[model samples]
Target: FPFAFMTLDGERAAARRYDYIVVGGGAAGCPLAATLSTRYSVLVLERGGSPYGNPDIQNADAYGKVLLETDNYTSPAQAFISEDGVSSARARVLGGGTAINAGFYSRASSDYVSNAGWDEGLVEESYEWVEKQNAFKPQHLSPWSSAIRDGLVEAGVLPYNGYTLDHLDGTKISASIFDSKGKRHTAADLLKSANPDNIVVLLNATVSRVLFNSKPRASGVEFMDGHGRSYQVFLNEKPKGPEVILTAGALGSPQLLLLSGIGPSKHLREFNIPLVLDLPLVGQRIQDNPIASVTCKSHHFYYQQIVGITQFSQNYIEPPSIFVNGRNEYNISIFEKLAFPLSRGELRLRSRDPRDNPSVRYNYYSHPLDFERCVQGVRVIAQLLNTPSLRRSNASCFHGSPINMSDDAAMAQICRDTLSTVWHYHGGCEVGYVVNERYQVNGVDNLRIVDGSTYRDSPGTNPQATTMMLGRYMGVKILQEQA
Candidate 1:
């Protein structure tokens, strides 16, 4: 049964008590809340409106329009210039980043799951659960993507392992959230699995802070609605009924932590927020799967949606990866993404206000290794464009201006200027450092985190599937604990 939902303006939300309070209705939170609602009363407080019935959100080709949006606070994405000064928006919808992202879905590689020490059997089962509902094998791989696929095989990312969801090194076509009829399926779709009577998903309700009782346990949360009304929802307050969980994406999680006074002591003291837990690494270890691209103008306007990914190897010093997909109005782009990035970044609060977006710095290519590998990755792109199969597209592949691919140094400079984000940010509230392996914050007794923010390192591909998988993993963990 679905728990009745009420906006902040309503009296029910402020008056009722829930067994669980979920912070964000995003990639992790949506599924997490759905799973928890099977056995517990869950209240999901989302800062954005529902993505259901939004034409631009439901349409298959509105990726760029969604990415370019700056001022839809009801759906709520904030544009920020990264430390490298590249621009991107944070996830602000009820489905979280899954609502706004390009909709590519792939399971994290076996190596990553093993490295994380997750129960492999349970993780695989979780992936299967998410795949059956949210993930779809794309019916259309762009003509250029097919060409790029063949070209990548010829370029030695070989074996042609086509259309598998596992993240393996080589050329492979991927899946998308857009299915056969062009309807977009977001993480919010997972809510269908929830017991409707057990869940209340309030949208456009910005959680200001996690509230605590005198014992310092998280009692509930404070939030403000789009209509400028404030409301507070508390837990059941028994010894074992309700708990607060932060699934508020990578950037939002750490920012909320800081706002709730669980951060570096010096910073909290400076802001005069009463100290809670001085976790030194709460906002550290930020990584956005950094991508620098080599764009080409193709006379062939044969279109398709997001098509495929190629993980390049050997010749490049680092784990150089590339995404071959359709971009902008009508062009296929080769995004030379760094599958393995060493440069870590940070997120800090601009002020005590939860509505204020955090100061995010990606610090792209800040390391010598990051720079050297990107230079080599672009060189690999030059090799890929020269492939005879790709040459047939009548494509004009070259640097935009002032930066020639011929000059290694100049190409490096262009990489810096042209390095844009793929918007796959994670690791702000990293595992093992900020939170323990169980996804629980180290010092907090009742609060747990399940989101992209929990990964210590990136999952080496688009992390939507991994993000959902982590939610499932945590959901099962919680269920087992109470059983």
Candidate 2:
């Protein structure tokens, strides 16, 4: 509440400067900016407006509505069609995907942290800090969720890890950003921890590109307001002054890099954009946790609050039905997401305009291993549905083609036919490729990326918690370096 809220137009009259400029006030941006604000001034340029009072964004029951109601510029969720011909969405609001997602929150696996070479102690502390402000344990599971939980356990998902936020190998009731009252708490809420005098957030401010000096050091950024008026803001000029951090999600961070002339030289030449850095890997290695789901009629409406993480795959169940012309149509959908998909894709600039959605090809299931994993995941889902707990609910009338659950070929076809996104797309600026271990871009100075874009693979069942933790973790690390 203390963070200053301004529009690009509001700051256009004066030459603006801040100790740090965080591009994108999404999950990572909010927390990172807040943590950094504790010591220095920070400016968060968010392309979308606030999530404060939007019912579609704040109510847990209205979960999928935001995705349905999307506009090119103003909608909280921006819809996109991938080259794979699958429909997906990108968060266009201040809290990023957390503002529009299903609200499930789980931490990254220990192996993920260790593999990423993150400080183990710092990782825990960062997660705790994020959980304190946004994560909440569900007070009670809806009937549908309870049934799925029991079904998962009965289907041999193994020891039940009830009410947890950790990513483990078993069925568990994970935490949610939604509270007992069914209100949503997004990463923007983490801004409450910031020093009011030190942080400012610009809403509906689309950052076009990062501005750099000849030394290839980032000095500031150029952005446009909703009305198309452009403005430039610079970092405070100190000896070891502030840096420009890009927490602009997977697609956004990569798109911004290309827009700022930090991508493949050949690709930049095609667009006639002067190349600042020939970072060949800037928009490569894109991955989305390919989700194959099935829907069945349910007796009651229920939100997704249960997950099953098995050796072969991860599964989730939810009843996100809505009223169609005054009829409360009820349905329970179970999704099986390939835990570690081998298939990778690329993202490119559809246009130089930052407001346009990037040309992304997740190339979902392009790899043989990824397709096989989906086959295994589907088998897992079929087994869960056959369990007594779920069968007793009589939630029949499956949405996909009728086939023997035991047939691998049939399941493989189901994997192809039912492929969709869990909205967990990551990469495009992966570690060891585009950035160094410290998250600093490989060929740039005073610039770093700290979001899902930097992930080689998605960290957990859901990437939100880990993404938010990275923000706080990097923030604290930067502070420590300054001290």
Candidate 3:
């Protein structure tokens, strides 16, 4: 009863009124809806089906399998090629990115929390609430993982923090949502805290648009089922009563806004949609952390649980390998990401259909400094791989040809040619431009966005932990405001 009840048919939900309607039951939405339901009747409309029994999503060892076989519909991950010509994916499951990622969990840096103007005490409490049930410490490190850790320390990443969830400088082993049994605990699991009687989750329900009244206040939403059947549902009327919240991630949320006629007037006009608000920054300033990596063959499968944080970059290890001849032989990717990129991009609707992916361009390394940082990061990767600890593994950088670490020109070329995404894409509906500090859309009423899209920059090592924490933090704040 933790998730309360979930259904696939949109017709059954048609005309129903709830105190709050939260769209997208992913990383932030699940926690937000669960917290809100403690007092108010809440409805969660998820575009994808539940993650309960999906084997590809359930096993941590099977990471990256979901992203390999995405389709137009129904795959746990939806694939997209950015205008930058980089391939990436968006979560199509209830847990959002948490359901598809490498499951590395770490808290946001203290400076990030303070910079966001979040309540320090409340932020700690919120993270605690999430970590209690979802995060777990690895019992032991795989040999490959240990080698990377030693290699990081050997390369002067300095002062190993050991196994800790705090976002400290230097290398450290972070938490994982995948428990000891190898089963994943995603944000969907956080729904267990909800008041069973107060929450109803509708799955396979893709919300097409938000409905507004003459006051331009968000009243409800119109959604559709897998069969393309549409249904309209309203908010329960009360004095200052219901609110519509969009947690449809960085891509889906902004696309929905544009589809509902809430973006720049000219762009909306192009789609023949009547303008609701001329918010030009709806999909502006989008960014994805640019990653450059080296993949080597390994004898074991290890999900990335260790990271190295430096002043300009972050290091991660991804072992997306396969088992062969009763032993695991996989590719272990040692990568560094440009931690704070200056480059920004935009997202726009490719079509009116909510099911279609929007056109996005992260414009990777558009800034001079961003490109420089990637070069430095790649240089560090070269040094780490050369370290005695890593050299002992006998794993040479094997993509096509061995890298010439000493060649600066070669490193620059690698930064451009091999640029990939850590999939930490954020900032479509950013805080200051699209939504205000309180997360309310600047020109909209009774609507809020609580997801990664609200982030001005990606937080911590990965955004999932902070994203989930924000959902709970905002929920508690809303409750406090009402009280």
Candidate 4:
């Protein structure tokens, strides 16, 4: 009946129990709670303020401000610089990454669903549910974007499929979360499906740890609101009715687990935390899409902000790999991102402080092939720039520190210096390591993880689509079990 109640409204919420307690009301939390509420009482605890009525979040052009602005604790997006030196952000709002990321929308590659052991039928239906809420084929695409599509075809990705959701060879206009009116729709909108009487959303409820018994069953969660006061939310008295579902992102989920004394024994000993489980891999195996950008100054006026994405393979490359998103705003910027990196990264607790951000290192290019692939990607972009289609756009390579493409060694150095990330954070609380196929955290009962953290591999495209799908699918799974 009411919108999410601020937990700051006294300790009344602290006294209540729930049939399901979901931490982190981001991409996974919103949909999972909404679906679970249909059959059981659910409580969603989030760390950020509400996203509703936030113009900076709703407007498309304000994307830069949302990512770059630092003094915005009141806003849903919180920017962070990784310990290894890449700068990016995560959502503190209800919508999770869907609120802050570049608004590109796509379905998980069918192969991804099959490999992840997800229900393909459910995956299709999940996308349809989310698409109906806010997805669309980008409208009135920028000229630079359209031209680049032709260039991708000329570069040898043949049989252009036009607009598509498949991660196939060939350039097509990609979908975006920004609707025709240029308004952003977020995962939080899916919460509209929740039965109000059964679902209670508490904003600014930062979960500190999972409360468990000697049997090591996750019985409840201990959290602190925006205020310093603490509270514990427990499962319902009904046997096996209540459970803890963690949908926090790759970083947050692992950090919480480690902080809750469920990580490597040696690491927990270092922090003087009593161990609940000796899961050495709790904070290991982090993955995010590596990105390198090429910017060129253009005389043409391309007022609309959009991505001209080219997903193709080179002669040396294999199918369904290598993606470059050519984004043109004030400057025509082609950002190259590599998927399926063999090199893995890790996350570490800087300290036991839940407020402190985990030290993260993507270990990008640790695998020699990852390094070679990124350089190859740049060469492909150079080819794209020289194509007749891009030439007509009158965009020229402009860099104060120009890259010498003639020397592979020199270009490799340039790529090394400029490489960052597309901010699609995944794993750390990985599948087959930290959790089982159903996303249940191993070594513990009544605890499940439902977020990007559980992904085995980064989705080929922007990961928001897969992340939301995961949330909805997990909700269905839990509901079926409870039924």
Candidate 5:
């Protein structure tokens, strides 16, 4: 009765049909469509509106940290460590999770990436392709950037040391992936600039379900409108043909898949949706690196001037390096072997509603090694602060001061309350554990996931660069399969 597509929301009703459909118009989806549209007509469906859509997002002088406030983007927050820690936040806009990240764009270590269980030659191949497309260039070094690097060098805090390709760690400071205009070179900006004629992006389109038969193939998607009206797309295949792609990101994709009966067998059966794939790991095994900033109050006014600079460490091997053991529950494990050395945490469904935020457990510093790593990480930050040049920058230890109110109890409380993330959340639909190596949902076809969600283990760095490469691989695979 609801036509061919199952239940597309109202926002997608006026949307145009196309040869190929890419869902969740975030980081991977945006770039994939941009590349595909060069040779094909594609339709991109975004659930959130533009980050720059709001004046707050565009106002650069307004604040220091825009992420926690949810000013310019939809935020991703998890329970962090407990039910009371149930903090859920992420970018709820067109660019996926990147729209609201702190804008720290870093490349993956060739060592770590090589170790991730991806396709053969996928990492090297995608790097070349992505680099050419975005004209990915080196960071622009400047005085401030140099100071950050020099300060680090003088700190003598580095347990292991190495150099980057461009070597911004010397007397010069390098530019961030965030360009000169305070704008990010994110997929949103790139896709918007592409200005493709055949491509259409629909904002505020809430995807409710996907239509399909007993078989695994998706016929089309359905959504609810702003006015609460329901509609379905019958996969017209008009202008060429219709194929559905899900790029709704880690959180959105799994929920959409489950709603469409394409997740773990138990969940599908529990929801009475009938399972297409019995993969029990759907939305489980979610992992995030243990990240907690060790802030020290500066003796001077520069304490507020946290620069947007980072180090491009190539080889850093701490022989007895402390480990930030993965997941919780291993924090106090005594024996190394019997230790759940690096067990990751998970994401579970709080309810059947897509509108309901998923249960997130950061499980960061859950293990002894993980907590010890944070201790070492803070020491590293302190070492850089003690350098002569850094010392001149008025670098000071973070405790209690006039600016934030100095008190041992208060500072300690701040330490506990200050737990934060590096914006690198992954593994909602883990590979091998949840999904498969090919980005495929074990038993389902025509459904693939290509985002931070697939990362089985944290690569110990900002995840965007790796995620960007992953996007390229997904695009290439889909096209190659078609050919």
Candidate 6:
């Protein structure tokens, strides 16, 4: 049975303090609470409800329910939801994005891992722990695997000698799975069994801001429930004991921080909110992976109608040795998936009201290189249709007239209309550059952030795994230092 949080009324000073005051019960928030409560008292604040007995969360394919969010996803500037044309879209459910995300469980390519400031032995080390924590299992490859690979390799988009834990240099990559039977699992499954005695959840509880006192020193948090009633929950009081952590997803976390006054001074003042930190980069430096997949009719549709992705970037980069062999291995122009490259985007505050959503200016493809890459990626996808492997598959062609796609106006319109988000939004209330490196507001104490709000860079892929990783990593660090 899952322990759901009830909005606290002032009558319940029930939690004067605890060993940990974790905010937001999704992703890292859940795990952090679980880990901390193993040895100490933990009180988790959540804005959503218990997934207890919810078949939607327990069932893998029913992931649709979580995606059709009934509540949550509210912001001051805009609606928590967008009507933009995108696929597998936005969600504001209990499991965070993990609840709706297609369970493609694979560690990011090493290049992405290393560039994100992760430690040298980080990928495996972190994943090793996560595998046990979430029980992630690689999928069993079969006919689908062969089809994806043959299509890429025969076309010379990828080479055979290379293979890595990730498709860093390959022309194609397949979805990571646990098994052919599809025994779907997620962090929600673990949260469903939260420890009742130690873990306390407050549903419909929105954390307006983390309460800080000095230069980026975290101490506690301030929040409101759905009833719109507000209060402060301090992790550190007369004698600090509990560690206050916020895990309110990417959009929620940063929005909360900005509302609490830990963001760009100018931006914060726009809403007449006082800037506690004057951190200009709070909502800046944001980037999310925007995809423009070209679904083409496989020519080899009959011979090898690919059911899944196979030889992407990962097929080219593998093994610590044989660097030279894989050096020039990938000419991504020949692949199908590289069809869309990532472009920088921004998350901005529309207003200070925590009840209102912020104005999101995605600004995708702002940089010329990224823009060109997207066009090239689309071009590559078009080329894949012309290949014999794909042609033999008899896959219905998934393109338009050359005159139409060739025109800059038509291409831009198509891009706007055919946008799909890989769910990688980050850096609204950035760390180091926005908040502090420790995820503390620059001018606050007794308050710290624990969600994607603190992210400064896009994690380059699905962020659910990595975002939760931040929650765990940040939680432990905060607890140990304070302890």
Query: Tens digits of per-residue lDDT for model 5 on 289-377?
Result: 43434343221211111122223332121100111222111111000101111536666655666555566665655565655444434
Predicted model with the maximum lDDT = 3
Score each candidate by Cα lDDT. Answer: 0.74, 0.83, 0.85, 0.73, 0.51, 0.51
Winner by lDDT between candidate 2 and candidate 1: 2
Residue 36, model 6: lDDT of 64
TM-score of 3: 0.95
* For model 1, the run of ten residues with the poorest summed lDDT: 314-323
TM-score of each: 0.90, 0.94, 0.95, 0.90, 0.74, 0.75
lDDT of 1 by residue, 47-126 (tens): 88778778767766555555555673544466777766778888788788877766777677778888899999999888
Candidate 4 per-residue C-alpha lDDT over 1-483 given as tens digits, one digit per residue, 9 for 90 to 100? 136533444266667888899998888788889999998888888877777787767866555456655443455667777766888778887788877666777666666778888888888888778778868776676656666677767765555767776665555566778777768888888898888888888887788899996548998888877778878888886235678999888888999999899999998899888999999999888887776666555434332222233444321111111112223243445656776777777888887667667888888788888888788776666666567776675443332434444567865875787787777778888899999988888989889888888876777466787788778888887777654
lDDT per residue, candidate 3, 143-248, as tens digits?
A: 7778778888998886789999898888899899999988999999989888888888898899999999873799899998889798988888723568999999
Residue 204 lDDT (model 4): 78
Could you report the Cα RMSD, in angstroms, for every candidate shown?
4.0, 2.4, 2.4, 4.3, 9.0, 8.4
| lDDT at 437, model 6 | 60
Model 4, TM vs. native:
0.90
Note the clash tally of each candidate. Answer: 8, 0, 1, 0, 40, 61
Report the lDDT tens digits of candidate 6 across residue range 4-120: 433344225334656667766776676667656655667777665555455555544343344444443442111243223233344344555555455544445566566556554
Deviation (Å) of 181 in candidate 3 = 1.5
Candidate 2: worst-modelled 10 consecutive residues by lDDT: 318-327
Ranking by lDDT: 3, 2, 1, 4, 6, 5
Highest-TM-score candidate: 3
